[model samples]
Structure formats: C-alpha cells, structure tokens
Target: MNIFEMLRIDEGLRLKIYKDTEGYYTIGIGHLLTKSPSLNAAKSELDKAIGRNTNGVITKDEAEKLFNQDVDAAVRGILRNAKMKPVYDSMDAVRRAAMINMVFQMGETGVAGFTNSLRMLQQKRWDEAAVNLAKSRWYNQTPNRAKRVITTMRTGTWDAYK
Candidate 1:
C-alpha cells in the first residue's frame, strides 16, 4: 500500500469531532480542527464536503481530503527537519512511509527523539534501526502499530501492509 493508505489504516477514520487520547478536539482522520488556523474555513470546507451546513459531521471524501492535507503537512515537516530530512531522503518509498507514519502519529519532535534509530536508518543498518525503535515508549504504548512500523523499517518493504 501507499503512504496515504497506510496512514488511513494507522489513524483510522473519524467523521465527527471527538476527544483524542490526549483529550484534544479532533476529527476527520485525526484532523485537529480546534487547532486549525481558521475555524471559519474549516466550517466552510466541512459544509462543502457534506453538501450542507453542519456543526459536527464530515463525509468520507472530505475526511480523505483532510487526511491528504495532514499527510502532506507531515511530509513537508519531515523534509524540512534537519535531523530527519537525510533519513527520509535515503529511504525507499516503503521505508519513507514508515518515517512519515511515525511523524504523523507522534509529531516531528517525537520522532526526532529517536536519534539512534534515525542514524541507523541513515547508515542503512536496518536491524539496528529496528532495535532502536523497539526501545521506545512509543513502541510500548502502541505495540501493534509500532510493531508494523518497526518491521517496515527492518524489511524496507511493503510486507507490513499485507
């Protein structure tokens, strides 16, 4: 699968506003409308997506659009990050998706903390990278997702998706 599909699976679909694990107001495949630059624009887009004025609902198509934007932001941010850009640039598409997925889930700062793993990835040391990743709080917190991501990093293939 592609990065978008992988993210869709990792994040899951949510068409309505809900409190996230950290209690932040989020919607539409983890879109944080509460933190959006313009609530007005968000509302307008929401209305357009659902073809009506609505307070708290979004369509799957709209959610996919928002998910795309969110993924783009994460990609751009990862590319811009000094520590992550090289790691990202050195990867194949499947491995790249793993990096983006981690960034999307935990933010650039969170992934940046995986210094050893990033270095291992840059060195093309797949097993070492996977080992470093497994030694994280993130791995412990989200074992299923992290396990898949770690496997992706180790294998540098789409086997994790299957």
Candidate 2:
C-alpha cells in the first residue's frame, strides 16, 4: 500500500473537528489544524477548495486532498534534513513510508530527535532501530500505530500495513 493509504488507516478520516488522544483539535484525516503552521492558511485553503466559508468542516474528498498535501509537506520536511537525507535515501519504499509515517505523526523535527535510531537505520540495524522506536513515549501514546510502524521498520515490508 502507499503511504497515504497506510496513513488513512492509521490516522483515520474525520471531516469535523475532534479532540485527538492528546486533546489537540484535529480534523480531516488527523490534520491538527489547531497546531498547524498557520491556522488561517489552513482555513483559507479549505474554504477555497470547498468554495464556501465553513468554520472547521470539510467534505471527504476535501479531506483526502488536504491529507495528500499534508503528506507531501511531511515528505519535503524529512528530505530537507541534512542528517536524515542520506538515511532516508537509503531506504526502500516501505521503509521510506515508515519514516514518513513517523514524521507525519510527529513533526519532522520531532522525529529527527531520534538520533540513535536514525543512525541505526542508516547502518541497516533494523531491529535496533525498531527497539529504539518502541522505547519512545510515542510508542506508548499510540501503541497500535507505533507497533505497525516499528514492525515495518524492522522488516522493511508492507506486511505490517496489511
């Protein structure tokens, strides 16, 4: 499956605002509009796409489009990191999606904090990298998603996603 498909299952689709597990205001395929880089930009984009001014609501098709944009942003964000660049480039599609998925949940900067794990991944120590990810509070906070991501990292396969 593609990264977007994996994310759709992991993040789930919500057309309206809902409090995430951490209580952040989230909407439209786990878009944390409340924590977005610019709330006004998000609102304007949604309004423009839907051709109307809705406070914080969107259609499923709009949600999918927004989700793709968010995923693209996450990809660019990860690729721009000097330390992550080489490691990310070394990965196959599945492992790359795993990294992107991690960055999608946490910001690129947040995932970059996993220096040791990234190094392990760079060195092809997949099991060690998986273990390191499992040790994080992120794993605890969202165990189901984390389990799948970690397994994907370890195996470098889409089996976890399936």
Candidate 3:
C-alpha cells in the first residue's frame, strides 16, 4: 500500500469540517482542531459535548495550509517512488512536478493506476502522457486542476494545479 492509498483509506480526500463525538471541530484528513477553551470551571468535558462554532473551527484557509504541509510530504514520498523507477529523474521539473501532483492528489490507487501515463512519461512521450492523465478519475474528480497538471506535464512549464 502506497502512502497516498493508505492515507486515502484512513482519511477523506476533499476538505471536510466536522465535530468529533465530543464536539470539537476537526477538518481535512482528520487534522484535529485545537484551541484553548474558556476556563469555565463548571463545564465538564461532558458539558463541552454541547454544539459547534468557530472556537475550534477549521477554516478554508487553514485547510489550504494543511494541504500545503501535506503536499511537501507527498512530494517527498514521490521522490522515493521515482527513485525506484529511475526513469523518473531525467524528466524536467514541470513534468516531475506533474507526476508529484498526481501522486499527491490521487494517492497509490489513483496515481499508481496511471501506468500508461507514467509509461508515457518514462518514454518522454509528452503528448501521450498529457492525454493519458486526462482520461482518469484524477481528471474526473477535478478537471480544472487536471488541466493544469496535464498541461504542465506536456509543456514543461510550471502550471499551478488549482
């Protein structure tokens, strides 16, 4: 099981904010929300089971930050994956970044399934690789984002996957 696959199994892919059973806010791949609660001596953990608000909320900005942190980690993981597949190193940065993006977003299942795409990448078939990446759930789930990655993969230009 690759890191992304394992992580995807254990966590949600898209951003989601929800209360745990104790009612504290949590979001985005189970990143727990933490904040100093009011020093109300009367309120037990039991009483804290009350409802939700911004106190320990996970905002979109915060969610984006979490993704930033995770992407670095994802890139690192892809570095290792690429190492095993030595043909990965020779690609230009934009192409490398595109593969990293695929592994980052799709995890092992979605990204690993891109055998044809990565094979195209290994062979330096930029056009085919772009076409290959487009025909998948990674694109299905996020077309606009896929366009950027696929375009970057083909053109060797840095295109931010929005």
Candidate 4:
C-alpha cells in the first residue's frame, strides 16, 4: 500500500489517544504528543469548543477529521515560511517533526517571528536555532516542550523528540 493510504488506514483505525509502549501520550496514526503546556492548554480549550465533554472523549471518526485538518494547516504554515521551508524539508524527520510540533503549538508566523530561532534554523545552525527557540513565549508557555525540543535540535536525536 502507498504511504498515505497506510497513514489513512492507521488513522481510520485510531479510536483515541492512548499511552505508547513507553507510556507516553499518543494519538491518531502514531502521532506522539509532546510534553507541552500549550498542548495541555489546548486540550483544555478542546472541551469548551466541542459539544461533548473531554470526559466523554472525541469520536473515532471525529479524530481523523480533526487530525487531518490540524496536520494540513500546520504543513501549510511550514510551507509558507520561506526561510524555514528549505530547512524544514531538508532536515531529518526528527528535526522536521520538532519544527512541525512547535508550529502546531504556536503557529508558523508565531514561531517565524522569532528572528533568533528561524534565522539560525534557516542558516542550518542547530545550536543557535535551539537557543533561539528558548527565547520566546512559545518556550515561555511550554518550558517542558521547549526543553525537549531544544535538546532534540541541539543533539540531532530522533528518539528525544518522539
């Protein structure tokens, strides 16, 4: 089967966010969640937006729709970022995932506005890029995620981001 078809098949079968083998949070099609305060905050927001309570959880079918829209929007944000686009595309999936992870949290413009972060990222300066990421409200809002993302970027470790 093709990659996206496999992706859909996996997502179609997803019922809910559950713990991974390592017991970390995960969701549709193997999307591992970061330890993000912003993500935590967003989850809190989810309950208010949807008719159902978080206690009841989202429907299985509903998850795919939400996941699709969210991913598409995040990627679009990445694509629109001219400076980060090349770097985002060329980097290893780990770094790309981290970049995408942050984008989903704050948005492309929210992140790209940080000259310290994107400037170094576009230039392939991993160390500086990570340092710059820490100097923002995104990091300020989600220090745990920032620590995780920063370390992953600096060390080039795929395992850490996941």
Candidate 5:
C-alpha cells in the first residue's frame, strides 16, 4: 500500500497541516513560504511534521492547519474554479482524500489545471476522470506514484502488496 494510504490521516493532524495564526494559512513547518533550502529538505520537514502529528503513522495531512471552515472554503474554491460542484461533493471519504492528496502534492494552481478531468468528474464520468488523470502531467512525471492514488480513488482500495 502507498505510505499515505496506510496513514489514512483524516483527523487529529488537522492542526499540523493548517496551523491557525492571525487568521491566515501560515506555513505550519516554521519555514518562510517559498524559502526551502531544497526540495529534499522541504519534504523532510513535511514528513517530520506528519510524523509528529500522526504519531509516526500517516504521512499525509493536507488539512492539518486549515480547520473545517478553511477546508470548506478551499473546497469551495476548487469547486468554483472547476465550475462543477457535484463531482467533488459526490466523492467518498477516501476519494476525497485522494483528491486532497493530489492537491497537496500539486499546488492549487496545478489542481486547477486539471480542467478536463475536473469536468469529467463533475459529470460523474469516472472512466473519463481516470483516463484524464492518467494522462495528466502528474502521471507523466510520477507514473508509479500517481497510479497508486488514482487506483485508490477509483477502486476505493489501495494495493496491499506494495
């Protein structure tokens, strides 16, 4: 199973992902925004924060800092930008998690760029969403990683033998 699938982080780690400070989404990891020395260091810090928040269990915490209100707002933002609300609304918890996971990996701008896929999802066009998702830059850049999440989103179960 993918490490993130095993962690299944949906609660508790919310605070760590979106720390509340001055009513804005500040970098919860104590680093200045866009000032990571390197991608490796950023990943390391993110991993550490996930470990600390989840007790060394789950490693994905897309909603950590942003509380329900903020998450709701963000979700709304996504839906609005996608011009399709039902697709996101119809997602199961796991599928929603997968979407959030993708959004976390690919920033909001990247997620927004999934134009055709978002439209397919909004139309409840699972097969099309799957195809479009697979054809995305995310899939091309990280085929194995993208497949894991996409598989979970489609099948509602991640491969256990990984």
Candidate 6:
C-alpha cells in the first residue's frame, strides 16, 4: 500500500486515518496511535522553534518539541562534543536544509554527533556528504526516508520539496 493508504487519508480535509484501541479506524488531526498532534502542521512550528532556539542551528529541545518527545538535553550534549559548530556555520541554504532533513530523521543527537560527516560537510565535499549520510544512525531507522534523503543530497535536487 502507498503512504496515503497506510495513513488512510482521502483527498478531503487532508486528515489522516488512524486505528483506535478497539481496532476501529478513525480520521483525525493528530497521530492515530499516539493521539498527539500530527507532524504535518507542526513542521513549520518546529522549524520556527528550531530556528529561534538554535539561532537557525537546531537543537535537541527543538527537535523534541517538534516530535513531541523528550530529546533536547541528550542532543545538546552530542552537538557540544561533536564540535560541529563550524560545519553548521559554513552551510548554504540548500545544505542547511539538507542537514535539517537529516536531523529530522536521525534526531539532533544522532546527526549532531557525526564527527567525520560534519567534517566532510564543512569542507563542501558532496561525494563524501552522500557517503557520510548513509552512515547516519537514521540510515535504516525508517522504511524509505533515509534512502530518499540521501538520494536527494546526492542528486542536488530537493524533489521532495517540489
């Protein structure tokens, strides 16, 4: 089944379908399982929060708030020790977007702690960027997200955005 099928959403209202405790399907604005607000509307809010909190740099708390989980302190620690500030400082808009995409998948701690990967990014090494991307903690975390994001970075096309 396709993603929309899995999500059980029709073209109307853009609402997602979810299964409930009694094995019944229902449509709603929040996650079907967790009952938390869905990530669709939260993306912009999370982006704004990340931009504001990290000075456009993204932190763990920002990520946790976006995901509605508790992940800030750990992510912050990783960013601190990974020494990635320089790499983050040098990124262009597209590259920065790519990093945000990475963080979205891997969580702030996992992506921020990638020492070798951050070095390659800081150096503007595209080939290495693709390689290092696959090495992330998020590489196989989800079904197809990692593969798609890596492909986007490799091709230099944000097809998902389009």
Which one is best on TM-score?
2
lDDT of 1 by residue, 3-78 (tens): 8888778778888766566555667887765544555666665676556877878778888877888899999999
Q: Which candidate has the highest lDDT of all?
A: 2
List, residue by residue over 35-120, the lDDT tens digit for candidate 3: 22432321232124323333333455655566566767667666667432454577865666666656665554457567777677
**Cα misplacement distance, residue 128 of candidate 1 (Å):** 1.2
**For model 1, what is the error of residue 123's alpha carbon versus the real structure, in angstroms, after optimal superposition?**
0.7
Off by over 4 Å in 6: 1-82, 160-162
Query: What Cα-based lDDT does every candidate model obtain?
Result: 0.83, 0.86, 0.57, 0.61, 0.53, 0.47
**Model 3 TM-score, all chains together:** 0.57
lDDT of 6 by residue, 16-81 (tens): 334443343322311222334553434434344445422223443433244333223333433564
Tens digit per residue, CA lDDT, model 4, 1-162 = 222332343234444555544454555544445444354544554554444666425676666666666767777888887866876887776567667666765667776777667667767798887777777765776576577767766766744434
Instruction: List the candidate 3 regions with Cα displacement exceeding 4 Å.
Output: 1-56, 59-65, 82-87, 159-162
Off by over 4 Å in 2: 36-51
- Selected candidate, larger lDDT, 5 vs 6: 5
lDDT of 6 at 85: 51
Q: Would you list the clashing residue pairs of candidate 3? A: none
**TM-score between model 6 and native:** 0.47
Error of 6 at 81 (Å): 8.3
Question: Is 4 or 6 the stronger prediction by lDDT?
Answer: 4
Q: Candidate 5, residues 106-151: lDDT per residue as tens digits?
A: 5567787777887776666776688779987678876766776777
Error of 1 at 59 (Å): 1.8
Off-target runs (Cα >4 Å) in candidate 5 are 1-85, 160-162
Could you tell which candidate, 2 or 5, scores higher by lDDT? Answer: 2
- If the candidates were sorted by their lDDT against the true structure, best first, what order would they fall in? 2, 1, 4, 3, 5, 6
Which wins on TM-score, candidate 3 or candidate 6?
3
